[PDB]
UniProtKB/Swiss-Prot annotation:
This is Pectate lyase A. The gene is pelA. Its EC number is 4.2.2.2. Binds 1 Ca(2+) ion per subunit. Disulfide bonds join C298-C326. The lineage of its organism: Bacteria, Pseudomonadati, Pseudomonadota, Gammaproteobacteria, Enterobacterales.
Length: 361
């Protein structure tokens, strides 16, 4: 088919881990027969059957992963809603309304998947029709909006929006006296995945958001992996884990975090979660957290079992913040790529906010 997006052929920028030890070009080398315009789930799966062949899949409008058929139970949702994105694929949204609902985009490296670009699309977090119960933890949801797993590498997520959308957590019902949690994580990066760049994106209205490194006992696979760069993104109304990391090495700069410690639905807990053997280099970020005083500035970064965290030039509610006394050891690893941390001002924060997410490419 014809290429509608004049930015569809672009590869990841020189900045970011997705451009280290190889380039992330997605399906830029696709032949005309492998350039698609999909308008529904059937056409989407058809396009994806090209497998590891270079392909460009242009998304028009809303793609209902359920195909208009509600999931009857866990098994049904598991069998139909987890859409795998193969190697050398560029999924790019057309216009301002390219969207996915009722499902998860899975970048699974088991088959060797690598070199994937997901861009300019909105993904509404899926609703688990059959949460599982765990004594002492309550109800738990299984499905995320996007998952990068099993060694998948060289992935560029750009101008993507992930949000609970039309079903927010205040709408949860109660079952057996406990909140019937139907939302899982937003974006997961785990099991040896590596070389990822997340740019100009928006995560809006969600609880358990971005977990990088899913288990403390999975070091054999995650040690020295999970390098992720995040810049010019907006994390709005997100409860926790803007980036909670285990084993991975995170570079987060010029991102905008907006929340409220007293939000009625997505109460701000913290932004950076420093887990087992995890490391975060935070630079020139903007934290605007209502009901969070300067004296409690360390709340933006929470220690779990990790200890590596450094911040350079970030701000809290408009003023420079010092987080050097929050109890962490400095991030000493070198950043291999050249990058430019712009001084964070309210003007820059607004610019980033105005350009973040799908429909803004």
């Amino acid at each position: 088919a014809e290429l509608v997006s004049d930015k569809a052929l672009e590869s990841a920028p020189t900045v970011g881990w997705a451009s280290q030890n190889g380039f992330t070009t997605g399906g830029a080398a696709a032949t005309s027969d492998n350039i698609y315009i999909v308008t529904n789930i059937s056409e989407f799966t058809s396009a994806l059957s090209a497998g590891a062949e270079a392909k460009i899949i242009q998304i028009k409008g809303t793609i209902d992963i359920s195909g208009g058929t509600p999931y009857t139970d866990f098994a049904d949702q598991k069998a139909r809603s987890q859409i795998n994105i193969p190697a050398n694929t560029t999924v790019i949204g057309l216009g301002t309304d390219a969207k996915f609902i009722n499902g998860s985009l899975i970048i699974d490296g088991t088959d060797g998947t690598n070199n994937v670009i997901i861009r300019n699309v909105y993904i509404q977090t899926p609703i688990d029709v059959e949460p599982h119960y765990e004594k002492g933890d309550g109800w738990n949801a299984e499905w995320d909006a996007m998952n990068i797993t099993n060694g998948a590498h060289h992935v560029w997520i750009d101008h993507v929006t992930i949000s609970d959308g039309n079903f927010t957590d205040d709408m949860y019902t109660t079952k057996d006296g406990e909140t019937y949690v139907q939302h899982d994580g937003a974006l997961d990066i785990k099991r040896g995945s590596d070389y990822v760049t997340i740019s100009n994106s928006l995560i809006d209205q969600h609880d358990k958001t971005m977990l990088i490194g899913h288990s403390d006992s999975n070091g054999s696979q995650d040690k020295g992996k999970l390098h992720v760069t995040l810049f010019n993104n907006v994390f709005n109304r997100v409860t926790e884990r803007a980036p909670r990391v285990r084993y991975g090495s995170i570079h987060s700069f010029n991102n905008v975090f907006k929340g409220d410690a007293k939000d009625p639905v997505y109460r701000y807990q913290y932004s950076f979660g420093i887990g087992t053997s995890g490391s975060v280099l935070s630079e020139g970020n903007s934290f605007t957290i209502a009901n969070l005083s300067a004296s409690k500035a360390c709340k933006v970064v929470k220690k779990f079992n990790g200890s590596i965290f450094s911040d350079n030039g970030s701000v809290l509610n408009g003023s420079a913040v010092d987080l050097s006394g929050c109890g962490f050891s400095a991030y000493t690893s070198k950043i291999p790529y050249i990058y430019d941390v712009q001084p964070m001002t309210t003007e820059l924060a607004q610019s980033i906010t105005d350009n973040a997410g799908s429909g803004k490419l």
